[PDB]
Amino acid sequence: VFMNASQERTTGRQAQISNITAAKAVADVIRTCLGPKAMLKMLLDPMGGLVLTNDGHAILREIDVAHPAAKSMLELSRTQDEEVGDGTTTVIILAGEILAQCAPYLIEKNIHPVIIIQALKKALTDALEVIKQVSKPVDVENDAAMKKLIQASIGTKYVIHWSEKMCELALDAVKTVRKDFEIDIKRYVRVEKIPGGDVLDSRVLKGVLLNKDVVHPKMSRHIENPRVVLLDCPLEYKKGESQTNIEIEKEEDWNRILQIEEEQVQLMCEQILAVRPTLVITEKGVSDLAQHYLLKGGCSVLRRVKKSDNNRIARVTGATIVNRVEDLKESDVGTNCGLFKVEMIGDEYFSFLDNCKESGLQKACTIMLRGGSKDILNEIDRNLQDAMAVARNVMLSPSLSPGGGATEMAVSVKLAEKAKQLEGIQQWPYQAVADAMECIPRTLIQNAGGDPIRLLSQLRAKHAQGNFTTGIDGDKGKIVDMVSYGIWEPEVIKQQSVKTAIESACLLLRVDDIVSGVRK
Amino acid sequence: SLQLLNPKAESLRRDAALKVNVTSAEGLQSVLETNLGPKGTLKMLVDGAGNIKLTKDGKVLLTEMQIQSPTAVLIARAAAAQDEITGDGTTTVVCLVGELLRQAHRFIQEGVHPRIITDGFEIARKESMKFLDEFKISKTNLSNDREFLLQVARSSLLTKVDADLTEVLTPIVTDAVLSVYDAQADNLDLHMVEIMQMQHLSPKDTTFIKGLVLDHGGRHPDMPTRVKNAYVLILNVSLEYEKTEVNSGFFYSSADQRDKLAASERKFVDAKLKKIIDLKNEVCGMDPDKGFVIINQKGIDPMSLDVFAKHNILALRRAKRRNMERLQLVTGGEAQNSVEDLSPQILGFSGLVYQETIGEEKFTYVTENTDPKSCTILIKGSTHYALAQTKDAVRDGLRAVANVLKDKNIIPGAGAFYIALSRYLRSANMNKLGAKGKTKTGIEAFAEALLVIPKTLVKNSGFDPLDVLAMVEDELDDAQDSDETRYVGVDLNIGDSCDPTIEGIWDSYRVLRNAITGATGIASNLLLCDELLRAGRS
Amino acid sequence: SLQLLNPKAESLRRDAALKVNVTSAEGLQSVLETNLGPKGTLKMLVDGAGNIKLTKDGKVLLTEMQIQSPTAVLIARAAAAQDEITGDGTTTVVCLVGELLRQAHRFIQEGVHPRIITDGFEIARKESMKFLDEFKISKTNLSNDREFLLQVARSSLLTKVDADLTEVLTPIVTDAVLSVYDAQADNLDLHMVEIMQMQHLSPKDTTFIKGLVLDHGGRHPDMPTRVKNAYVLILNVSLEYEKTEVNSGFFYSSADQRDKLAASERKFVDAKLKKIIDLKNEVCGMDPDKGFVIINQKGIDPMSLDVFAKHNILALRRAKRRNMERLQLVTGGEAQNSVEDLSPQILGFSGLVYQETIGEEKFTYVTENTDPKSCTILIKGSTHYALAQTKDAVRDGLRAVANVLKDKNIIPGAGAFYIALSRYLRSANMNKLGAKGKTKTGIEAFAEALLVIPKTLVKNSGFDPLDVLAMVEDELDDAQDSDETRYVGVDLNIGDSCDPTIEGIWDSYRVLRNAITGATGIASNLLLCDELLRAGRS
Ligand SMILES: Nc1ncnc2c1ncn2[C@@H]1O[C@H](COP(=O)(O)OP(=O)(O)O)[C@@H](O)[C@H]1O
Ligand SMILES: Nc1ncnc2c1ncn2[C@@H]1O[C@H](COP(=O)(O)OP(=O)(O)O)[C@@H](O)[C@H]1O
Ligand SMILES: Nc1ncnc2c1ncn2[C@@H]1O[C@H](COP(=O)(O)OP(=O)(O)O)[C@@H](O)[C@H]1O
Ligand SMILES: [Mg+2]
Ligand SMILES: [Mg+2]
Ligand SMILES: [Mg+2]
């Protein structure tokens, strides 16, 4: 025989037919996961957990497909999630259609897969132009419009009923992380969960939330003005780096060796008491003896705190990451701490750190979630990532594109009108771009239960005459303009949807053959 | 769409995903339907070898029997998470999600959308939160009514155990909870109240001890057993040998250096014992009448136990982290870890310290304190499952009664809350509400689903559930016009209505609040899901 | 307990047997309800041999697909008895049993016994007969109008095929029962019509033939296919060599006797055929345009075909048993077995007889009869499955139009009887109760279970069932505000009420009788079933 190949070489036209059918199959799984009346999806992972959601990205993380063309479609959700954080299902559902509409031609009119690519870049160049023209700017400092902008994505989720609280929850969190350009990052956004409780009393509080309690019982559970000092090192005597081997000759040496173990922990504790802190947060563990004299000054000792939770404390309290204790000064000590208090919950203890609230480093915060169960917490946490992702685009880009499919439908109309004046060989793939852009409103009408035949016919008749902000009401299923409807989305999500969907088609269209089982 | 992608997979969609969530809900509901109520059936769980553990708590049934269905694991986390923080309302969450799905599924078959149905549950839930403010009643804690706490304790204990165990175990909880209330009004359950296992005469012989009981005693025979006035001392220092960070050989040259060096090795222990002797010299007066006891968190060397035995000092080693955080509350002293700085102020006080042993184990009892800020509940039992049954009963009883002191309100039970919400949702004017369209049946579905809980109590007694609500409905029709505010109940003894205000049946506030909130979230999320699938690498 | 008797046995009792009965009925309902109405979907019964067949009747779907569940076997047997005696309404039986078990199980979960539930169905069933006999209307069939039979046939055939084929085929059904009628004896036979399977132009190119059509052609080429006037002659004895029953053999003495003994068999052939030749010239000798055809059930000797070919005699063989009754009804002849007695009176008459060569076979067509009491229907099609589809359509459509002549009463369709029967079974004041608060639970369950038929039609059309029924209950109520019989229906084109009578939709009287009677009996016995068992020897 010959090399590890040639099992069944899918070559010629049938290879591309399987890819268009495979790419269409990925969109059919989450066809119902779009619009305000979207259905949820419970996926069963093989480890033992469960993922309850409707986001296309979180659905496609858990699924596993043994096909190489569908896996490239699987990776597009990571492009959208780790770029903005909203519209992942929009990316997957649009590309499917682009690959599908271009297929008739590939299969029958024999246009080679390179001429379609040249047609799409001019469509991509024109798509950014009309998306730039259709979008209207909006003021960033208007809190009334910002709340309606944040809740546009929440409306397609379960917590639309609590949208009055989530917009206030997300707006306060984004402004805390926002640095005075206007760059923010979600790594300090703490996703700590508390099972049980009501969503109404759930609120954001400035500062951190630990899972641990104090070590000694005599520690003060209520401090007016805490002074936090971060420690990295072990506060206990440690073995040390080199090969050591003390050799003891006299009887007065072993008690001296055990006595210097007590005096070294005294020396590091006494220099900590030069500034007299109230709360000492150590990264690594703590000894039972050093804690005892940390007590003889008025400090408070905690268990080992992982690094992550200390970098947030450094920005909240204003302290610095300190390992060498001999170089401890008064300037690097945290201050302006609001309040200290420990609540009793049956799961674990929880220590609260509040801030005085009154440029410098960006402040961190922890968002309290009080759901119904464990899956409700993970469901609501992903909604905050989808809701807070919307708040970044308006700050980075003041443009605001219309929602409800009006933006993509505007791309469909202009590409359809300009396709007549684009006479040549590029006309057939260029006109097929509009056929897929008019599907993302078609999916909303199908989920709403209406007839998309007459609605889209009524849409195109009023889109040219009425206005550029016309769209479909997902709840009622009638034509309602986005100006009166009062729901808007950013323009950045529309750019990534058009760019990622077209750029994905240019990769997959160049596939000629599929050969499986070569080597590792 | 999934078969050409994945060569092996399973997919249910648009009719089986709805039937699975309802069928699994009705299946899991039938398991815990019979356990709900006072006359419910017990349930044992014997896993591998035949370990036996007996309880009626739905959390123990769910978190011990492995389950394969994808719906029930969310009901397991929901029933567990609600009980883990609140301590009560486990089966109530399963019955609501167990009933609200089947009560909505009949209308899904009629063709109503799942989105607008769950929209009706959410706006109906907000009406129940507004109804909790008017339905609850204010209670002032300054009165310090012990009879009110006794009736709350019998609500949960009558459900788990019979009247013989309830009457003897009820004042054990009331005496423990009576000390919780103080001027600071800060509740503390885990540190203050504890549970300890002890195989003894019977479950009925459970008694209350005001001080901290310990599961260890004096190792040496000559050390004193009983002490009248024992001043405790807390020391977290370890008095056995300390190994010493890389320190190696006591390189000895002649044979004598050896003796010398062993003696040396001890010197570290005697340096710490001398501080205890110096402390005993300050409190040496009335040495035969008074006494001294040392409690260590880490182990004590057996060579040093003879030092304490000669001075008649009681020794206790290897205590828990929680007990060191409780000696200050019981004895009133202060904690210490090192031996350099000592004083007589940190020493506690105890009026009676005695030890009693059975078989190989030995227990140390402390009680008769001057002003004890904490206490314990030493439960007696025969078998291991008897302790597990008392574990869940005391664990659920303390959390239920403790929540009454957290807030200034209490909710009457016995179906009064569910029957009141039925008339409220079925008689309230819809024009005041903001819901329109096909939200007509969503109000009726959730309002009618609450009725199945109070008749599940009747299903365990064997009476006709529909007939014992006839006079209940007729009572409320005349109660509104009679100008008399009363709340009806469901008495299973005679099969007739009752008043929970005089009978003493009560329920906590956050149980019913968190139950409907957790149940409505889980039931809504299961309705909107229209497809099930399994895929992943393994 | 059953395991002690037979370890290999199983038993589900009192909760698992009820879920099996309801889930199997709902599972059978969810699959088979889609065929109800004109907008229903087509099923492809693809067996292991690759045989494809299109149909919408529930009888043939359940006959080919073997049923594994024990509950659905009882429902399939009910559809068999429904299709056997009536031939229509199988989809209504499975939907009524599924809905009755659904609506009943809704109340069994509320703590109601199955006995009084089934007692209410029987009182509700008897109440419907007292409503049905007043709801029907009487018409005079003596006029034999074609317009009423066409619209009645169009209502039954629209539920099998689309509109353009129904308009072509709906005159074929009305032409089936033209001459088959007897006023005094009230005898009407359905089996006299003959269904021939053949491949031709298209299904939409079929046509009605007045006389009989046989599937046998002329063996010899010399005999004439075109015959202007034919006198039929019925034979039943076989003209070929029949071994003498009593074993025998020709032992010839010499070679000269061989051909003579061969001629002995020729004498018996010529003996019985000489009377046939004498029968021909008895009527008239040398008469052009007057043939003579012979129809024999058994085979014909190929040696004797030369005798029939010389005299221009059409001979057919291997005819069917039931066709012997159809010859005398069409041609007006008389059946004969032997040839001992012959006459011109026993012979029939035919105005036109011709043959057509279609493929490798030839079909004999006999038309132009004077007063034929029977006819036939050619089932032409473009495939194998269209023949079975059109055969089931005719066999289901013949019973709907034949019942109009068996009993003059006829019920309007379009869900009019189910909608009108819902209101009548709401409040039984003091007519037939039997007990207080017991029978009325079954009256409510039976009334709500009958309205699934018009809702299922709306679900297939793709509109909301509650919205289109809101105007409908409303229409009926406004009608009541006038004391007038305005029968309302369900139009699936626009989603609005319509008159069943004016528009053109009817149902047979015996369909609703056996459907409600059969569904109520099966729904009652399955509710009474509390335990399923299996036992036997493998
Ligand atoms: N209320 C609404 N009515 C109509 N269309 C909507 C509505 N909300 C969102 N959409 C449409 O759904 C698309 C996706 O929005 P969203 O659900 O927030 O993102 P994702 O697809 O990531 O869940 C948008 O392109 C928008 O046009
Ligand atoms: N003796 C009783 N009389 C009337 N109602 C009772 C009695 N005991 C318990 N109940 C009712 O049973 C319900 C469930 O009680 P409990 O066992 O504390 O919660 P769960 O069953 O959810 O664990 C409560 O709503 C309570 O009103
Ligand atoms: N054109 C129509 N419009 C409305 N209802 C119809 C129509 N045709 C049939 N039906 C309804 O369908 C029911 C069953 O008819 P049919 O489908 O012929 O029998 P089966 O369901 O046994 O095949 C009848 O009760 C009738 O009311
Ligand atoms: Mg979104
Ligand atoms: Mg309880
Ligand atoms: Mg029919």
Side-chain angles (χ1 to χ4, degrees), chain A residues 34-36 55 86-90 152-153 156 403-405 408 440 444 472 474 485 489 494:
Chain A
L34 187 66
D55 184 17
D86 187 11
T88 65
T89 319
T90 296
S153 298
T156 65
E408 286 78 347
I440 189 167
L444 302 172
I472 308 99
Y485 196 70
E489 296 183 357
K494 304 297 185 180

PDB file of all heavy atoms in Angstrom, chain A residues 34-36 55 86-90 152-153 156 403-405 408 440 444 472 474 485 489 494, ligand 1:
ATOM      1  N   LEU A  34     -32.694  33.156  18.415  1.00  0.00           N
ATOM      2  CA  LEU A  34     -32.537  34.543  17.993  1.00  0.00           C
ATOM      3  C   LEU A  34     -33.857  35.276  18.185  1.00  0.00           C
ATOM      4  O   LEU A  34     -34.928  34.675  18.053  1.00  0.00           O
ATOM      5  CB  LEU A  34     -32.092  34.620  16.527  1.00  0.00           C
ATOM      6  CG  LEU A  34     -31.723  35.993  15.953  1.00  0.00           C
ATOM      7  CD1 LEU A  34     -30.467  36.550  16.612  1.00  0.00           C
ATOM      8  CD2 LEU A  34     -31.539  35.901  14.447  1.00  0.00           C
ATOM      9  N   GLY A  35     -33.771  36.567  18.504  1.00  0.00           N
ATOM     10  CA  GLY A  35     -34.934  37.403  18.684  1.00  0.00           C
ATOM     11  C   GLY A  35     -35.374  37.466  20.134  1.00  0.00           C
ATOM     12  O   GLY A  35     -34.816  36.790  21.003  1.00  0.00           O
ATOM     13  N   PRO A  36     -36.392  38.284  20.425  1.00  0.00           N
ATOM     14  CA  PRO A  36     -36.852  38.404  21.818  1.00  0.00           C
ATOM     15  C   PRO A  36     -37.601  37.185  22.323  1.00  0.00           C
ATOM     16  O   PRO A  36     -37.588  36.937  23.535  1.00  0.00           O
ATOM     17  CB  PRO A  36     -37.757  39.641  21.782  1.00  0.00           C
ATOM     18  CG  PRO A  36     -38.257  39.696  20.389  1.00  0.00           C
ATOM     19  CD  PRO A  36     -37.163  39.148  19.514  1.00  0.00           C
ATOM     20  N   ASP A  55     -27.401  31.752  24.280  1.00  0.00           N
ATOM     21  CA  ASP A  55     -26.323  32.380  23.528  1.00  0.00           C
ATOM     22  C   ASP A  55     -25.672  31.351  22.613  1.00  0.00           C
ATOM     23  O   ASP A  55     -25.361  30.236  23.043  1.00  0.00           O
ATOM     24  CB  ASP A  55     -25.297  32.977  24.489  1.00  0.00           C
ATOM     25  CG  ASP A  55     -24.184  33.725  23.775  1.00  0.00           C
ATOM     26  OD1 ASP A  55     -24.347  34.061  22.583  1.00  0.00           O
ATOM     27  OD2 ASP A  55     -23.139  33.976  24.412  1.00  0.00           O
ATOM     28  N   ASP A  86     -21.103  40.465  22.323  1.00  0.00           N
ATOM     29  CA  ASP A  86     -22.524  40.486  22.008  1.00  0.00           C
ATOM     30  C   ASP A  86     -22.708  40.211  20.524  1.00  0.00           C
ATOM     31  O   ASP A  86     -21.887  40.629  19.702  1.00  0.00           O
ATOM     32  CB  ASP A  86     -23.155  41.837  22.379  1.00  0.00           C
ATOM     33  CG  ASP A  86     -24.669  41.846  22.225  1.00  0.00           C
ATOM     34  OD1 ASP A  86     -25.268  40.766  22.035  1.00  0.00           O
ATOM     35  OD2 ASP A  86     -25.263  42.942  22.293  1.00  0.00           O
ATOM     36  N   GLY A  87     -23.780  39.507  20.187  1.00  0.00           N
ATOM     37  CA  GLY A  87     -24.083  39.166  18.817  1.00  0.00           C
ATOM     38  C   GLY A  87     -23.397  37.923  18.300  1.00  0.00           C
ATOM     39  O   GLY A  87     -23.101  37.856  17.102  1.00  0.00           O
ATOM     40  N   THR A  88     -23.138  36.936  19.160  1.00  0.00           N
ATOM     41  CA  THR A  88     -22.453  35.727  18.713  1.00  0.00           C
ATOM     42  C   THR A  88     -23.369  34.860  17.860  1.00  0.00           C
ATOM     43  O   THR A  88     -22.934  34.295  16.850  1.00  0.00           O
ATOM     44  CB  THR A  88     -21.939  34.939  19.918  1.00  0.00           C
ATOM     45  OG1 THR A  88     -23.048  34.471  20.695  1.00  0.00           O
ATOM     46  CG2 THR A  88     -21.048  35.815  20.790  1.00  0.00           C
ATOM     47  N   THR A  89     -24.639  34.740  18.251  1.00  0.00           N
ATOM     48  CA  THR A  89     -25.604  34.011  17.434  1.00  0.00           C
ATOM     49  C   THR A  89     -25.857  34.720  16.108  1.00  0.00           C
ATOM     50  O   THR A  89     -26.162  34.065  15.106  1.00  0.00           O
ATOM     51  CB  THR A  89     -26.915  33.839  18.204  1.00  0.00           C
ATOM     52  OG1 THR A  89     -26.627  33.513  19.570  1.00  0.00           O
ATOM     53  CG2 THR A  89     -27.775  32.725  17.601  1.00  0.00           C
ATOM     54  N   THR A  90     -25.745  36.051  16.086  1.00  0.00           N
ATOM     55  CA  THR A  90     -25.898  36.793  14.839  1.00  0.00           C
ATOM     56  C   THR A  90     -24.788  36.451  13.852  1.00  0.00           C
ATOM     57  O   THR A  90     -25.011  36.437  12.636  1.00  0.00           O
ATOM     58  CB  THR A  90     -25.917  38.296  15.131  1.00  0.00           C
ATOM     59  OG1 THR A  90     -27.069  38.618  15.920  1.00  0.00           O
ATOM     60  CG2 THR A  90     -25.947  39.108  13.841  1.00  0.00           C
ATOM     61  N   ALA A 152     -30.990  46.820  25.518  1.00  0.00           N
ATOM     62  CA  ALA A 152     -31.361  46.286  24.212  1.00  0.00           C
ATOM     63  C   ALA A 152     -31.011  44.807  24.111  1.00  0.00           C
ATOM     64  O   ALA A 152     -31.798  44.005  23.596  1.00  0.00           O
ATOM     65  CB  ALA A 152     -30.669  47.082  23.105  1.00  0.00           C
ATOM     66  N   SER A 153     -29.830  44.427  24.606  1.00  0.00           N
ATOM     67  CA  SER A 153     -29.421  43.027  24.604  1.00  0.00           C
ATOM     68  C   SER A 153     -30.091  42.231  25.718  1.00  0.00           C
ATOM     69  O   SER A 153     -30.304  41.024  25.565  1.00  0.00           O
ATOM     70  CB  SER A 153     -27.902  42.925  24.735  1.00  0.00           C
ATOM     71  OG  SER A 153     -27.253  43.532  23.633  1.00  0.00           O
ATOM     72  N   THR A 156     -33.490  40.261  24.919  1.00  0.00           N
ATOM     73  CA  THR A 156     -33.464  38.934  24.318  1.00  0.00           C
ATOM     74  C   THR A 156     -33.088  37.831  25.303  1.00  0.00           C
ATOM     75  O   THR A 156     -32.760  36.724  24.861  1.00  0.00           O
ATOM     76  CB  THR A 156     -32.483  38.914  23.141  1.00  0.00           C
ATOM     77  OG1 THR A 156     -31.151  39.125  23.624  1.00  0.00           O
ATOM     78  CG2 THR A 156     -32.835  40.003  22.137  1.00  0.00           C
ATOM     79  N   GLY A 403     -31.291  48.886  15.366  1.00  0.00           N
ATOM     80  CA  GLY A 403     -31.459  47.471  15.639  1.00  0.00           C
ATOM     81  C   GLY A 403     -32.697  46.898  14.981  1.00  0.00           C
ATOM     82  O   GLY A 403     -33.313  47.547  14.130  1.00  0.00           O
ATOM     83  N   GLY A 404     -33.072  45.682  15.368  1.00  0.00           N
ATOM     84  CA  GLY A 404     -34.243  45.049  14.795  1.00  0.00           C
ATOM     85  C   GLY A 404     -34.094  44.646  13.348  1.00  0.00           C
ATOM     86  O   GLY A 404     -35.093  44.584  12.628  1.00  0.00           O
ATOM     87  N   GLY A 405     -32.872  44.368  12.897  1.00  0.00           N
ATOM     88  CA  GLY A 405     -32.627  44.013  11.517  1.00  0.00           C
ATOM     89  C   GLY A 405     -32.633  45.169  10.538  1.00  0.00           C
ATOM     90  O   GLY A 405     -32.456  44.936   9.336  1.00  0.00           O
ATOM     91  N   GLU A 408     -28.994  45.506   8.834  1.00  0.00           N
ATOM     92  CA  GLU A 408     -28.705  44.493   7.826  1.00  0.00           C
ATOM     93  C   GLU A 408     -29.657  44.594   6.643  1.00  0.00           C
ATOM     94  O   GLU A 408     -29.262  44.307   5.507  1.00  0.00           O
ATOM     95  CB  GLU A 408     -28.773  43.094   8.441  1.00  0.00           C
ATOM     96  CG  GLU A 408     -27.584  42.726   9.333  1.00  0.00           C
ATOM     97  CD  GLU A 408     -27.650  43.358  10.713  1.00  0.00           C
ATOM     98  OE1 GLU A 408     -28.473  44.275  10.914  1.00  0.00           O
ATOM     99  OE2 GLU A 408     -26.876  42.933  11.597  1.00  0.00           O
ATOM    100  N   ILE A 440     -31.944  37.718   8.403  1.00  0.00           N
ATOM    101  CA  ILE A 440     -31.884  38.011   9.834  1.00  0.00           C
ATOM    102  C   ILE A 440     -33.129  38.762  10.320  1.00  0.00           C
ATOM    103  O   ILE A 440     -33.441  38.645  11.514  1.00  0.00           O
ATOM    104  CB  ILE A 440     -30.570  38.733  10.212  1.00  0.00           C
ATOM    105  CG1 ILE A 440     -30.431  38.837  11.739  1.00  0.00           C
ATOM    106  CG2 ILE A 440     -30.433  40.117   9.579  1.00  0.00           C
ATOM    107  CD1 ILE A 440     -29.050  39.233  12.206  1.00  0.00           C
ATOM    108  N   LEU A 444     -36.599  36.594  12.737  1.00  0.00           N
ATOM    109  CA  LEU A 444     -37.405  37.217  13.782  1.00  0.00           C
ATOM    110  C   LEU A 444     -38.892  37.006  13.527  1.00  0.00           C
ATOM    111  O   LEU A 444     -39.666  36.794  14.468  1.00  0.00           O
ATOM    112  CB  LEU A 444     -37.086  38.710  13.872  1.00  0.00           C
ATOM    113  CG  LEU A 444     -35.633  39.103  14.154  1.00  0.00           C
ATOM    114  CD1 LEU A 444     -35.459  40.608  14.023  1.00  0.00           C
ATOM    115  CD2 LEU A 444     -35.189  38.634  15.531  1.00  0.00           C
ATOM    116  N   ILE A 472     -38.931  45.359  12.353  1.00  0.00           N
ATOM    117  CA  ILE A 472     -39.988  44.440  12.763  1.00  0.00           C
ATOM    118  C   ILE A 472     -40.009  44.391  14.283  1.00  0.00           C
ATOM    119  O   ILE A 472     -38.969  44.184  14.920  1.00  0.00           O
ATOM    120  CB  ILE A 472     -39.776  43.034  12.165  1.00  0.00           C
ATOM    121  CG1 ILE A 472     -39.582  43.123  10.641  1.00  0.00           C
ATOM    122  CG2 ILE A 472     -40.953  42.093  12.531  1.00  0.00           C
ATOM    123  CD1 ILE A 472     -38.128  43.080  10.198  1.00  0.00           C
ATOM    124  N   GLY A 474     -40.466  42.394  17.358  1.00  0.00           N
ATOM    125  CA  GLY A 474     -40.383  40.966  17.610  1.00  0.00           C
ATOM    126  C   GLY A 474     -41.505  40.424  18.468  1.00  0.00           C
ATOM    127  O   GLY A 474     -41.895  39.262  18.313  1.00  0.00           O
ATOM    128  N   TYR A 485     -39.889  52.942  18.699  1.00  0.00           N
ATOM    129  CA  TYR A 485     -39.712  51.737  19.497  1.00  0.00           C
ATOM    130  C   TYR A 485     -38.710  51.928  20.627  1.00  0.00           C
ATOM    131  O   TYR A 485     -38.837  51.274  21.667  1.00  0.00           O
ATOM    132  CB  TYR A 485     -39.268  50.581  18.596  1.00  0.00           C
ATOM    133  CG  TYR A 485     -39.410  49.208  19.215  1.00  0.00           C
ATOM    134  CD1 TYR A 485     -40.662  48.646  19.434  1.00  0.00           C
ATOM    135  CD2 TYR A 485     -38.290  48.464  19.560  1.00  0.00           C
ATOM    136  CE1 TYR A 485     -40.794  47.390  19.993  1.00  0.00           C
ATOM    137  CE2 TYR A 485     -38.412  47.206  20.118  1.00  0.00           C
ATOM    138  CZ  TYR A 485     -39.666  46.674  20.332  1.00  0.00           C
ATOM    139  OH  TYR A 485     -39.790  45.422  20.888  1.00  0.00           O
ATOM    140  N   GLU A 489     -28.948  49.423  19.305  1.00  0.00           N
ATOM    141  CA  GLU A 489     -27.743  48.645  19.559  1.00  0.00           C
ATOM    142  C   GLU A 489     -26.522  49.381  19.008  1.00  0.00           C
ATOM    143  O   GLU A 489     -26.675  50.278  18.172  1.00  0.00           O
ATOM    144  CB  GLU A 489     -27.839  47.257  18.914  1.00  0.00           C
ATOM    145  CG  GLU A 489     -28.948  46.391  19.486  1.00  0.00           C
ATOM    146  CD  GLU A 489     -28.981  45.004  18.879  1.00  0.00           C
ATOM    147  OE1 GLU A 489     -28.176  44.733  17.963  1.00  0.00           O
ATOM    148  OE2 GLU A 489     -29.811  44.182  19.319  1.00  0.00           O
ATOM    149  N   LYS A 494     -22.443  45.384  14.505  1.00  0.00           N
ATOM    150  CA  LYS A 494     -22.817  45.199  13.107  1.00  0.00           C
ATOM    151  C   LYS A 494     -21.583  45.050  12.224  1.00  0.00           C
ATOM    152  O   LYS A 494     -21.617  44.334  11.218  1.00  0.00           O
ATOM    153  CB  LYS A 494     -23.679  46.372  12.633  1.00  0.00           C
ATOM    154  CG  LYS A 494     -24.944  46.638  13.462  1.00  0.00           C
ATOM    155  CD  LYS A 494     -25.925  45.472  13.426  1.00  0.00           C
ATOM    156  CE  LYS A 494     -27.218  45.812  14.150  1.00  0.00           C
ATOM    157  NZ  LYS A 494     -28.187  44.681  14.127  1.00  0.00           N
TER     158      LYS A 494
HETATM  159  N1  LIG D   1     -36.808  43.494  20.718  1.00  0.00           N
HETATM  160  C1  LIG D   1     -36.311  43.120  19.515  1.00  0.00           C
HETATM  161  N2  LIG D   1     -37.079  43.140  18.403  1.00  0.00           N
HETATM  162  C2  LIG D   1     -36.605  42.773  17.198  1.00  0.00           C
HETATM  163  N3  LIG D   1     -35.339  42.358  17.006  1.00  0.00           N
HETATM  164  C3  LIG D   1     -34.456  42.289  18.030  1.00  0.00           C
HETATM  165  C4  LIG D   1     -34.905  42.674  19.374  1.00  0.00           C
HETATM  166  N4  LIG D   1     -33.851  42.512  20.192  1.00  0.00           N
HETATM  167  C5  LIG D   1     -32.812  42.060  19.443  1.00  0.00           C
HETATM  168  N5  LIG D   1     -33.175  41.929  18.150  1.00  0.00           N
HETATM  169  C6  LIG D   1     -32.301  41.458  17.044  1.00  0.00           C
HETATM  170  O1  LIG D   1     -31.588  40.290  17.457  1.00  0.00           O
HETATM  171  C7  LIG D   1     -30.221  40.358  17.046  1.00  0.00           C
HETATM  172  C8  LIG D   1     -29.328  39.797  18.147  1.00  0.00           C
HETATM  173  O2  LIG D   1     -29.561  40.493  19.369  1.00  0.00           O
HETATM  174  P1  LIG D   1     -29.164  39.818  20.776  1.00  0.00           P
HETATM  175  O3  LIG D   1     -30.143  38.700  21.042  1.00  0.00           O
HETATM  176  O4  LIG D   1     -29.016  40.926  21.790  1.00  0.00           O
HETATM  177  O5  LIG D   1     -27.693  39.216  20.489  1.00  0.00           O
HETATM  178  P2  LIG D   1     -27.321  37.645  20.504  1.00  0.00           P
HETATM  179  O6  LIG D   1     -27.706  37.167  19.125  1.00  0.00           O
HETATM  180  O7  LIG D   1     -25.835  37.640  20.762  1.00  0.00           O
HETATM  181  O8  LIG D   1     -28.131  37.025  21.618  1.00  0.00           O
HETATM  182  C9  LIG D   1     -29.922  41.813  16.715  1.00  0.00           C
HETATM  183  O9  LIG D   1     -29.228  41.912  15.467  1.00  0.00           O
HETATM  184  C10 LIG D   1     -31.269  42.510  16.653  1.00  0.00           C
HETATM  185  O10 LIG D   1     -31.530  43.006  15.336  1.00  0.00           O
END
